Amino acid sequence: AGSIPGRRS
Amino acid sequence: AGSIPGRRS
Amino acid sequence: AMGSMERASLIQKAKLAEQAERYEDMAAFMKGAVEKGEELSCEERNLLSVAYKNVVGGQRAAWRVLSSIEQKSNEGPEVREYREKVETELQGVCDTVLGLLDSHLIKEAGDAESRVFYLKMKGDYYRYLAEVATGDDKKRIIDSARSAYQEAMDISKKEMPPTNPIRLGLALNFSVFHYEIANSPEEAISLAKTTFDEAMADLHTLSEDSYKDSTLIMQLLRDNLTLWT
Amino acid sequence: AMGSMERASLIQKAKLAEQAERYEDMAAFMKGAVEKGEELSCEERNLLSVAYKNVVGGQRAAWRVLSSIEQKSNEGPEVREYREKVETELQGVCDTVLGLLDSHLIKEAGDAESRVFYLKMKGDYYRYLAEVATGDDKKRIIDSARSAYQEAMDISKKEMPPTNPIRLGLALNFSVFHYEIANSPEEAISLAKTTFDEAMADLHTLSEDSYKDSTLIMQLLRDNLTLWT
Numbered sequence: 111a112g113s114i115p116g117r118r119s
Numbered sequence: 120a121g122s123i124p125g126r127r128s
Numbered sequence: 129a130m131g132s133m134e135r136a137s138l139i140q141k142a143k144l145a146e147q148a149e150r151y152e153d154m155a156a157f158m159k160g161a162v163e164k165g166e167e168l169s170c171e172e173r174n175l176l177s178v179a180y181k182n183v184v185g186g187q188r189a190a191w192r193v194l195s196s197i198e199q200k201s202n203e204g205p206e207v208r209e210y211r212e213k214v215e216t217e218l219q220g221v222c223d224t225v226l227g228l229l230d231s232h233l234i235k236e237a238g239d240a241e242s243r244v245f246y247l248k249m250k251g252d253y254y255r256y257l258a259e260v261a262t263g264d265d266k267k268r269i270i271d272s273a274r275s276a277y278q279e280a281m282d283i284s285k286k287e288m289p290p291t292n293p294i295r296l297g298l299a300l301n302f303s304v305f306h307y308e309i310a311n312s313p314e315e316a317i318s319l320a321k322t323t324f325d326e327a328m329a330d331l332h333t334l335s336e337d338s339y340k341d342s343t344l345i346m347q348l349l350r351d352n353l354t355l356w357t
Numbered sequence: 358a359m360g361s362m363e364r365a366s367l368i369q370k371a372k373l374a375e376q377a378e379r380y381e382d383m384a385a386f387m388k389g390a391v392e393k394g395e396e397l398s399c400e401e402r403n404l405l406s407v408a409y410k411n412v413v414g415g416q417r418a419a420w421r422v423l424s425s426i427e428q429k430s431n432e433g434p435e436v437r438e439y440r441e442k443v444e445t446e447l448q449g450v451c452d453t454v455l456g457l458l459d460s461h462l463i464k465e466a467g468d469a470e471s472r473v474f475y476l477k478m479k480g481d482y483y484r485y486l487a488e489v490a491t492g493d494d495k496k497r498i499i500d501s502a503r504s505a506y507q508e509a510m511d512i513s514k515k516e517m518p519p520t521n522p523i524r525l526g527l528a529l530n531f532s533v534f535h536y537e538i539a540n541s542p543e544e545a546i547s548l549a550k551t552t553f554d555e556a557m558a559d560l561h562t563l564s565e566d567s568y569k570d571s572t573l574i575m576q577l578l579r580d581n582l583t584l585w586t
């Protein structure tokens with residue numbers, strides 16, 4: 111299950 | 120030009 | 129630690145740190161910027177979130193590797209000791225982020241966009257605490273995550289369109305919370321499906337660029353639904 | 358910092374840190390192990406080298422990103438200040454490694470395998486210092502790299518077969534030194550070609566597993582020759 115990767119602006 | 124990657128044991 | 133550096137310089141250096149993939153530095157620059165006491169712009173909120181998500185993401189990945197080794201070993205003290213060290217460091221980063229949100233980003237956030245963004249962060253960092261918690265305050269940590277996500281959901285449903293990327297990402301992450309943390313897979317599936325369907329019905333209102341932003345997150349919702357059903 | 362932890366526990370934790378991709382921790386555990394004062398085994402030398410190569414490799418990649426941005430900006434002070442910060446941190450790690458080699462890994466290394474390994478490390482970390490050095494001690498740093506690599510080469514050619522992986526990796530890295538640092542591309546090409554050819558002629562002596570180890574590094578020599586010619 112994937113959350114928002116959220117690791118690139 | 121590549122040196123030894125050397126980053127995995 | 130960053131008290132002597134100008135706010136604008138901290139922001140500039142956070143952007144450089146991202147380009148250099150120096151996420152610990154990026155997080156420290158953005159913590160310094162928050163501690164200047166001014167509200168954050170949309171772009172600045174994203175820099176804060178990206179920095180800490182990368183830092184805690186690496187810690188979580190390491191904790192999972194070590195937890196797996198430790199569980200296999202229980203089927204010397206070093207694996208447990210080192211998992212504990214990584215766990216304490218992870219908890220410290222989550223506590224730092226939660227402390228920035230509590231002092232004083234959330235209370236100063238009056239627009240729906242900023243308040244939802246910060247409450248989603250609060251849910252996420254309590255969720256990361258819950259991933260490593262065992263029994264004693266596991267329940268209270270889980271409830272803190274749930275409460276933050278629920279308040280963010282309530283605001284987002286009143287104040288944002290169903291395609292808004294923050295509203296979509298909030299729903300995605302709250303669905304992961306339900307599935308992975310709260311042992312509520314049916315609630316996770318229901319939330320992901322309803323969110324996807326309501327966004328689909330609102331795509332017609334969007335420009336080409338907004339369409340791309342919203343459909344990217346919708347695909348993540350679909351990816352989870354495919355894995356869960 | 359690691360003085361209270363057992364040597365064997367530091368080694369165990371360095372292996373766990375590698376699996377968790379926690380290379381800063383891995384380097385700190387291996388520094389603690391070196392500082393116990395005992396010589397290192399082959400496996401332990403490799404853990405030390407892997408840890409620091411990963412740490413300094415990330416610093417070098419960041420320094421190159423920032424140096425490129427700074428050079429474009431020269432065609433506020435923040436880009437230079439941040440490049441300087443990363444540069445100082447990189448220099449500190451290289452100085453730490455060089456200090457472990459000088460106190461006292463090299464002087465206690467009597468077998469050719471260990472002495473060549475440590476002298477190759479010394480050449481590499483002076484080479485990384487040379488990559489960021491400007492003018493004042495650039496020349497002296499370059500000569501320190503060259504001297505370490507040359508002593509390692511002299512021992513390796515007397516004491517190891519031409520297919521030995523450490524001998525091959527030493528020659529590869531010394532050729533990169535010639536090409537990238539010493540402005541001697543012809544020396545780089547000559548060394549890579551002679552090393553490759555002498556290894557090829559010795560492959561017949563090897564087992565299947567040794568053959569795989571040696572041919573992997575030979576391909577790296579070939580890859581550079583293809584890029585340089």
Ligand SMILES: *Cc1ccc(S(=O)(=O)N2CCC[C@H](O)C2)cc1
Nearest residue numbers: 114116174248293294297298341
């Ligand atoms: C929780 C979250 C994080 C990031 C996104 S995004 O990648 O779609 N995005 C960041 C930049 C501003 C955009 O409005 C949203 C979505 C949700």
Ligand SMILES: *Cc1ccc(S(=O)(=O)N2CCC[C@H](O)C2)cc1
Nearest residue numbers: 123125403477522523526527570
């Ligand atoms: C400088 C260097 C580093 C690593 C190698 S290797 O990957 O071939 N290897 C490490 C483990 C022991 C082997 O003998 C060599 C070669 C050169």
Ligand SMILES: [Cl-]
Nearest residue numbers: 167236237238
């Ligand atoms: Cl406000």
Ligand SMILES: [Cl-]
Nearest residue numbers: 396465466467
């Ligand atoms: Cl010895």
Ligand SMILES: [Mg+2]
Nearest residue numbers: 133134135136
């Ligand atoms: Mg000011």
Ligand SMILES: [Mg+2]
Nearest residue numbers: 362363364365
């Ligand atoms: Mg002891």
